[PDB]
Design a protein around this ligand. Structure first.
Ligand SMILES: NC(=O)c1ccc[n+]([C@@H]2O[C@H](COP(=O)([O-])OP(=O)(O)OC[C@H]3O[C@@H](n4cnc5c(N)ncnc54)[C@H](O)[C@@H]3O)[C@@H](O)[C@H]2O)c1
Ligand SMILES: NC(=O)c1ccc[n+]([C@@H]2O[C@H](COP(=O)([O-])OP(=O)(O)OC[C@H]3O[C@@H](n4cnc5c(N)ncnc54)[C@H](O)[C@@H]3O)[C@@H](O)[C@H]2O)c1
Ligand SMILES: NC(=O)c1ccc[n+]([C@@H]2O[C@H](COP(=O)([O-])OP(=O)(O)OC[C@H]3O[C@@H](n4cnc5c(N)ncnc54)[C@H](O)[C@@H]3O)[C@@H](O)[C@H]2O)c1
Ligand SMILES: NC(=O)c1ccc[n+]([C@@H]2O[C@H](COP(=O)([O-])OP(=O)(O)OC[C@H]3O[C@@H](n4cnc5c(N)ncnc54)[C@H](O)[C@@H]3O)[C@@H](O)[C@H]2O)c1
Lengths: 270, 270, 270, 270
């Protein structure tokens, strides 16, 4: 496979896109270090939470590919827990080639109506939590000496801010900037850093209830959420997003660092 | 008198660019609500801090333009302080036409070498603090019913992330997103929201030794910091930045909302 | 006035936006060199053409501002005619401070359905014609030695390409590039170069029959043409576009070169 | 292989990037239609031209992959030649799945110093010739009814214009626009359209002598041409660009349409 004998570290791997990346990267030959908070993060995040069962199942799916999975329940806002998982992973697998910084949360409210808890939770998990993930993994990837590839999961909202979630758009634009700063800073080490910007991926993060409420109260907001030109009905799958991550993780994308890749089937073109 | 009889609320107004905006908007006719921490923000911010004398100085300069100045020492991370200043300001002036969210801080370190204090300070002042400023002022502007103009001070690093300051670049990209989400959400209220992206402005924030050290350690980082094509030697002034803020604040820029204006004499073109 | 004693050269000045710039820059104190083809460009351009009477009217409006107008019927694709008008303008006024490259045409068709005529006309007037305008005017501005400001009229379709007019979108993206290349090349001469990107300006170019037909045949294209957030009904006026041009033309925008200014009341945010 | 039983049409296939794409897509299992002017395009293009022999070598390299090659000497500016090659191609192969519009030329000069020959050659080949290529191929792809993937070769200068070649930067920005217009127009047909933006690729197009002449006269222009952060010395190869084209051509990129992919090893981040 394109990743035979390599090792990837993936956050938010309990379900959804994170699980898809873990399984796909395993299918490509990588052993997997995977973590997820496996719990509701906040009263302000109103869709269904991931469970520890979900993470165990990612691990079974990785093992089904003939690979090894080290999994752990942790919060990416918990620096000590991240350091320890990285250390345990390096002891078990001995190298670190791919990082997928994927854990995130979403909530909704107009900028001046957002609460402290809404703000702090989204900025804290999405932006600070990603930074902590990067700070914990980068030294191990440098020390391993094999170069590497880091994929930061931003959002289409990380390139074009959307109404009703300025805190989420801010967190995700912040991720675009981290990706690009880190691409410059890690160039000399042979480590590439790129970001993906998905749209309309069918996971529990998309709460149809929340969207209907937003468009009910502010009908003009619909103009920020158009159909996808090459798939004008319904949603893309988490596995489809994993096609992009697999390619970025491997040598086929050796010419890309600092790129913002929209995974949106054309929606950002409208 | 492009702003005759109007009221502007400005953060970080003790000195530097914030001072220049206060005095200019005053000379255009606006009375001024202005605030600043007037103290060191963090050991991690190594250049000289502003003083309470600086903010009194801004107040006197505004008064010399024939206008009123309400000033206060507060931290933009202190929500109650912000709310109280907005309330006292509305009591005194009865309207709010312009917000210039200008308070900010800078420090330097590669992404994986940043400390919790460096990160938390930059994200908390620049991103969260700006959000708190917007949340505290937007409802007064809506209630006044005269529409208005909000200027968010981002940076050239909020459009093109730079090496050695990923936290700062993230904070300022986050501000780009806040500007654009807010522009959409406030359009129906007749309030325009735009961001400026300065480069090389002569204020204490760019005392040169930090940058000298960064380049000495990481020589390749110089490529991210080119000359300004229309001023290839030296620095732009804080009063030059206030020309742009003055035009965005007033009606001459009525066709602009959601725009990112580089104030860089062309440096972003390189 | 902000442009007192200065001289501006404006193309497509017979009506619409170009007329509004001519009259506005005259009100600011500038003398005006104004030109327009005053004729239908092509059978492929289906809205009403400008007439010589239109250009004489622009001249009368300039003269009512107390300023002088040199006007000339010419085609921006005609190099000799451009060179001759620049020369006559320098003989009359002895200087050249502002250039507004505004002449433009529009037609509609899907990429693979466009005719040679449709393509050649739009590329030829918009992209090549603007280039000829800059080549003919830039040497005179340099020679005069007072620095200057050049405004290139692109479109929102010069930043975000639209369906049904790939030729026009390509021409206007070409103008964004020309603006930026020229800004770098002219920096050393003290000449600023910026582009404006309007949307939904009420001129004959936007007679609604063509757009109505495009939408009826290709209904999904409607997603590319959202409302303006701060003006969700109707169109902006040519005089409103002239507010931005006037500011760019003068010293208040001395910190801007190489900037792309959307004049769209927020529409590109959606 | 990923493109087994499919057909790809490639322009500029005599050598350099175009040859790399033809041989790679053949290795993935596609039969090839390939064409090239195999002659000097213009006195204004000063580096060595491709030869008919170059194109025959490409054909052999395709046949070595065990695939069929239909090749033809033609100018992409020549519409009848394109239609006839497309027609012969469909008769021979029966379908058309991938188009790589790669033919291009480069020359150098400041905007107001460019000759008519310089301008007309670069716009005619790069912008108009690419348009003609798309207009000739898109109908055949639609009629075949299998969807498809179209790759437009722009340049880093199609994202960030460069000094000394405003005409080339304009032509390549125009290609960005064509890509995105076409992505919206072709979505309903299951045809994806994406653009690549390479930098520093080792082909005859990079003439060390012309660069040295440019920097000799205008030293400040060097700031637009930085090193590649993940390959700070030397050039990337044509085969490395072909990794990106092979991925875009195939189903692994099914989530991408309207994307601008920089192929620059990070250079655009500086
Ligand atoms: N669903 C979409 O349409 C969409 C679009 C663009 C971007 N995104 C982003 O994609 C990424 C994956 O989201 P998803 O769609 O699979 O949704 P999801 O909610 O199903 O998956 C996110 C996972 O992250 C975990 N997580 C949340 N906070 C965490 C924390 N503090 N520490 C550790 N783990 C945490 C969750 O438990 C969950 O398992 C997220 O970053 C999200 O913002 C989603
Ligand atoms: N100087 C530059 O080159 C440059 C370039 C681009 C952007 N910026 C941005 O411009 C803005 C103004 O900075 P400047 O150049 O005038 O530097 P400065 O340090 O001279 O001024 C910033 C002011 O903000 C105040 N401030 C900092 N943290 C605060 C807090 N928590 N609460 C209240 N006040 C606080 C400071 O006391 C100071 O008076 C900042 O947002 C900065 O990030 C500066
Ligand atoms: N109307 C809009 O909504 C809109 C939006 C974005 C950009 N634009 C651009 O604004 C600019 C001004 O257009 P407008 O809206 O005022 O439309 P308009 O057609 O009323 O004005 C354009 C003027 O350019 C002149 N012209 C056309 N081809 C010429 C040529 N070859 N040589 C000399 N003159 C020529 C015309 O005769 C006409 O007077 C154009 O470049 C157009 O592409 C318009
Ligand atoms: N080399 C670089 O660094 C670089 C960087 C960015 C983009 N590009 C672009 O990549 C593409 C490939 O260029 P390359 O680097 O392989 O250079 P190249 O000159 O080796 O290849 C270009 C090929 O296109 C052919 N061609 C030129 N004009 C033609 C016409 N009118 N009709 C048919 N064929 C024609 C040439 O004969 C040549 O074989 C071009 O579009 C170029 O602009 C190159």
């Amino acid at each position: 496979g394109s990743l035979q004998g390599r090792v990837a570290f993936i956050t938010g791997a309990a379900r959804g896109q994170g699980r898809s990346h873990a399984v796909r990267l395993a299918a490509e030959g990588a052993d997997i270090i995977a973590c997820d908070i496996c719990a509701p993060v906040s009263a302000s995040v109103t869709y269904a939470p991931a469970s520890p069962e979900d993470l165990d199942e990612t691990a079974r799916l990785v093992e089904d590919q003939g690979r090894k999975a080290l999994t752990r329940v942790l919060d990416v806002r918990d620096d000590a827990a991240l350091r320890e998982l990285v250390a345990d992973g390096m002891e078990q697998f001995g190298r670190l080639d791919v990082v997928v910084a994927n854990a995130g949360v979403l909530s909704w409210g107009r900028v001046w109506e957002l609460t402290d808890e809404q703000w702090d939770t989204v900025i804290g998990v999405n932006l600070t939590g990603t930074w902590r993930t990067l700070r914990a993994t980068v030294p191990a990837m440098i020390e391993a000496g094999n170069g590497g590839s880091i994929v930061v999961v931003s959002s289409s909202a990380g390139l074009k801010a959307t109404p009703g979630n300025g805190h989420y758009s801010a967190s995700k634009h912040g991720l675009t900037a981290l990706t690009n700063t880190l691409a410059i800073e890690l160039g000399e080490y042979g480590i590439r850093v790129n970001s993906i910007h998905p749209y309309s991926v069918e996971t529990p993060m998309i709460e149809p209830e929340a969207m209907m409420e937003i468009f009910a109260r502010h009908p003009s907001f619909v103009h920020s959420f158009p159909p996808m030109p090459v798939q004008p009905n319904g949603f893309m799958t988490a596995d489809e997003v994993a096609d992009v991550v697999a390619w970025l993780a491997g040598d086929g994308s050796g010419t890309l660092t600092g790129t913002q890749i929209p995974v949106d089937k054309g929606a950002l073109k409208y």
